[PDB]
Amino acid sequence: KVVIIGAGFAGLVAARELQTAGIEYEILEAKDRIGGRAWTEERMGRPLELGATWVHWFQAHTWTEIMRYGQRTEITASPSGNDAHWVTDGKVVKGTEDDLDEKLTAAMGVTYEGSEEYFPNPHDPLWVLSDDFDGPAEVRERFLSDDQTNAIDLVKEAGFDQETIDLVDAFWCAGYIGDPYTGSALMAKQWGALSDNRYRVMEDITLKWKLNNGMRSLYDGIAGDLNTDIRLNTPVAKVEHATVTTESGEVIEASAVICTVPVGALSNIEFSPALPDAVQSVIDDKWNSQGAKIWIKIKGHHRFLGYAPKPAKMSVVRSEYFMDDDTTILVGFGYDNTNIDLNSIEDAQAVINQWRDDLEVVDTTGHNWVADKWAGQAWGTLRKGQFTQGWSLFDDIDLFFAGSDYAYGWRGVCVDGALEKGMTTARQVINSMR
Numbered sequence: 001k002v003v004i005i006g007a008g009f010a011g012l013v014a015a016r017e018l019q020t021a022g023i024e025y026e027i028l029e030a031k032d033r034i035g036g037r038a039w040t041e042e043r044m045g046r047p048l049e050l051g052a053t054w055v056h057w058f059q060a061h062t063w064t065e066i067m068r069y070g071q072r073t074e075i076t077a078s079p080s081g082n083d084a085h086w087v088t089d090g091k092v093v094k095g096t097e098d099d100l101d102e103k104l105t106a107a108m109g110v111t112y113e114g115s116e117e118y119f120p121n122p123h124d125p126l127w128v129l130s131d132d133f134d135g136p137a138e139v140r141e142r143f144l145s146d147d148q149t150n151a152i153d154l155v156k157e158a159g160f161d162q163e164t165i166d167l168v169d170a171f172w173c174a175g176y177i178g179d180p181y182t183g184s185a186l187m188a189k190q191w192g193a194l195s196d197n198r199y200r201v202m203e204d205i206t207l208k209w210k211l212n213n214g215m216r217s218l219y220d221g222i223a224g225d226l227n228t229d230i231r232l233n234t235p236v237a238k239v240e241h242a243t244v245t246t247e248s249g250e251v252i253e254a255s256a257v258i259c260t261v262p263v264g265a266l267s268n269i270e271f272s273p274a275l276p277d278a279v280q281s282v283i284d285d286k287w288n289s290q291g292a293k294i295w296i297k298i299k300g301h302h303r304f305l306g307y308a309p310k311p312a313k314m315s316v317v318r319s320e321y322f323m324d325d326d327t328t329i330l331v332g333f334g335y336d337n338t339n340i341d342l343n344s345i346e347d348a349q350a351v352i353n354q355w356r357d358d359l360e361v362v363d364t365t366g367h368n369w370v371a372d373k374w375a376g377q378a379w380g381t382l383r384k385g386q387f388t389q390g391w392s393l394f395d396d397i398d399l400f401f402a403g404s405d406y407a408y409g410w411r412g413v414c415v416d417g418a419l420e421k422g423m424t425t426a427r428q429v430i431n432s433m434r
């Protein structure tokens with residue numbers, strides 16, 4: 001009688017884990033679909049990922065599901081060797097993708113400066129603050145200071161030129177899914193630590209390999225294993241911790257509640273008792289994910305890569321599919337969901353016009369996760385101070401919080417973190433039950 005709130009990857013894998021242990025469960029999902037912020041949907045002639053897209057075999061939890069559900073060889077690399085463009089002091093620079101990669105690689109070396117001392121085990125991100133920490137007190141001081149520094153200032157303080165600063169600004173507008181200047185640099189350093197402290201591996205893990213059959217092949221796979229029907233169109237309005245009340249007034253009694261609703265949507269639920277003050281502050285300030293993901297279709301087959309810094313409508317845009325009607329579908333990430341209408345052709349044209357006054361856009365699409373009352377955010381990213389006093393505070397309770405945003409590893413940004421934390425939270429419930 002464990003109630004799981006939400007049928008995203010975290011709730012689905014938690015349900016399967018409870019099923020293995022013979023523990024009764026039920027998933028309540030607000031929407032008329034499963035998958036959450038992973039959503040494979042036919043748009044503009046093709047199945048497109050409106051949320052989660054890229055995977056890698058160095059992501060333990062994602063890769064095990066890829067193997068489980070038959071997708072081992074069903075991955076394809078995104079287009080590479082694109083003609084690259086980047087905006088720096090208001091002007092467009094042209095170059096090779098290798099040119100751009102080399103600049104980012106140099107900047108990442110400084111950005112990841114401090115990961116080998118903080119993250120010898122990159123899956124123990126708070127080791128420096130633990131009582132097992134046996135390093136110099138100065139490392140702890142630097143760790144805490146880095147939570148209050150954004151990733152771009154690290155590159156500025158190292159003396160890189162404005163062209164590199166503008167590239168890194170663009171890069172982290174996309175990576176921090178919002179305003180990178182409010183972000184915690186420790187997020188970037190942990191990404192380095194999980195990627196052998198090498199830019200190319202980090203890009204290999206986060207932005208290279210796509211699922212031919214979509215994230216839906218994984219989340220429908222997990223759902224297909226479940227012996228208990230998921231209750232769609234059943235939003236939870238109250239959690240007593242247990243008792244769950246739906247929006248319709250149904251009261252469902254529970255032994256435990258696994259809540260996978262993300263921070264951007266937690267204010268839809270009334271908790272009794274109230275959540276700890278430190279958790280409420282995070283919800284009030286949420287996380288670093290105010291941006292948006294667009295899919296743009298242009299005439300012709302063009303191998304294109306574009307970078308632009310804040311406040312551009314989109315900061316990273318890249319060719320992804322070359323369609324059979326002589327069009328190209330490009331993906332884009334931007335820092336501010338309110339400065340772009342993902343479904344307006346003129347706004348998508350304005351994006352492409354950041355770099356090339358040609359390349360007319362014939363179609364565009366996307367889902368604005370931040371304006372979605374059941375998400376309220378894109379992928380979770382960290383504001384200043386939220387590495388050490390943010391994601392880890394949802395472990396207290398009494399009611400359990402699970403989701404990518406609380407993972408120890410590829411937190412927020414990857415399905416790997418949802419599969420990690422959904423599974424380990426189910427183990428917390430399993431361990432408590434006898």
Ligand SMILES: Cc1cc2nc3c(=O)[nH]c(=O)nc-3n(C[C@H](O)[C@H](O)[C@H](O)COP(=O)(O)OP(=O)(O)OC[C@H]3O[C@@H](n4cnc5c(N)ncnc54)[C@H](O)[C@@H]3O)c2cc1C
Pocket residue numbers: 005006007008009010011028029030031034035036037038050051052053054055206234235236237260261262265268269292293369373374375377378379402403404405412413414415416417418
């Ligand atoms: C634009 C974008 C691109 C991404 N790209 C990638 C990528 O390339 N690779 C990658 O690995 N990851 C990617 N991700 C991250 C990945 O999507 C997430 O890490 C993961 O899907 C989050 O899963 P979750 O189960 O923690 O949360 P969610 O998927 O948010 O699941 C929570 C569920 O709870 C439901 N819910 C909300 N409120 C209620 C309520 N009151 N009652 C009941 N149900 C409720 C929601 O509808 C949802 O189904 C991306 C995310 C975004 C936003």
Ligand SMILES: NCCc1ccc(O)cc1
Pocket residue numbers: 052171174175206207333379413414
């Ligand atoms: N949804 C996360 C996708 C992503 C990962 C890394 C990066 O630098 C930009 C985007």
